[PDB]
Write a protein that binds this ligand. Structure first.
Ligand SMILES: Cc1c(C#N)sc(-c2nc[nH]n2)c1C
Lengths: 273, 9
């Protein structure tokens, strides 16, 4: 422990999440990502089952990291005097969904369906584990290009899932729902569904629909690319202005546009290889 | 048309 267990490589990226380095676990040459967070920048703290006081991000990652899933899993973590270091899986080769959509433009609906289905399964898995991500967006989704699997990252804005109202939010505003913009109040699942509507529009049109507060609360969805009427209907449903008018996850996955999804390996061979 | 990332927070 701990500079002896891992070989550190190039900086992958930095920002509101911290600084993330490529790495290799010396034990077995498993590729990892090594994420450093400074203690002074951490706003939300939690307690591990053992009672150890850790960043909420560690709490949430531990709750979602058991078993296989579409979430980048936490393998280990360490406390330093001024920071926490998180050891995470690193699929290879990868590209995040933001860069993927930038380079390829609007995605074919078959490909958007496969990606969107996998994001729904991943978000369902988080909610089943008691975890609300609160920052679903293309920047927080990695694509394993060989396996055709999508992986959720960056739980640094998340929370334990509850059925009462949330009055705090630190995710991405252009993915946040109109009830947050207008009233600084939202419920977890219906807010998640809103961000998934933003994400689906992003995939099939090549960029997000709203950039300004007035557009978010105006709730008019102009389609800038050719999109089937069934996909348009699902998007507009997810972006219903009234939270209670939005679909549940079950209603999304039962939607006609969502049927006959490709398998992950079919998605890779057809669209990614 | 400009496409951009959006920081969290
Ligand atoms: C596995 C991994 C990457 C790769 N390859 S980039 C990244 C990350 N996390 C937050 N921001 N960027 C993670 C967790």
């Amino acid at each position: 422990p701990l500079e002896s267990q891992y070989q550190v490589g190039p900086l992958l990226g930095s920002g509101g999440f911290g600084s993330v380095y490529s790495g290799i676990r010396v034990s077995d040459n498993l590729p990892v990502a090594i994420k450093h967070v400074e203690k002074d920048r951490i706003s939300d703290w939690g307690e591990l089952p053992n009672g150890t006081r850790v960043p909420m991000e560690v709490v949430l990652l531990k709750k979602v990291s058991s078993g296989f899933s579409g979430v980048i899993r936490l393998l280990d973590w360490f406390e330093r005097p001024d920071s926490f270091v998180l050891i995470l899986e690193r699929p290879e080769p990868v590209q995040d969904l933001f860069d993927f959509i930038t380079e390829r433009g609007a995605l074919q609906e078959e490909l958007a369906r496969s990606f969107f289905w996998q994001v729904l399964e991943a978000v369902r898995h988080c909610h089943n584990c008691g975890v609300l991500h609160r920052d679903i967006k293309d920047e927080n989704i990695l694509i394993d290009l060989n396996r055709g699997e999508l992986k959720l990252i960056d739980f640094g804005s998340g929370a334990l899932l509850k059925d009462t109202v949330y009055t705090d939010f630190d995710g991405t505003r252009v993915y946040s729902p109109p009830e947050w913009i207008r009233y600084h109040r939202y419920h977890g699942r219906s807010a998640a569904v809103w961000s998934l509507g933003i994400l689906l529009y992003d995939m099939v049109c090549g960029d997000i629909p709203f950039e300004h507060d007035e557009e978010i609360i105006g709730g008019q969805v102009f389609f800038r690319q050719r999109v089937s009427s069934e996909c348009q209907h699902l998007i507009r449903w997810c972006l219903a202005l009234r939270p209670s008018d939005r679909p549940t996850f079950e209603e999304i996955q039962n939607h006609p546009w969502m049927q006959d999804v490709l398998l992950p390996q079919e998605t890779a061979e057809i669209h990614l290889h | 048309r400009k496409r951009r990332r959006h920081p969290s927070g």
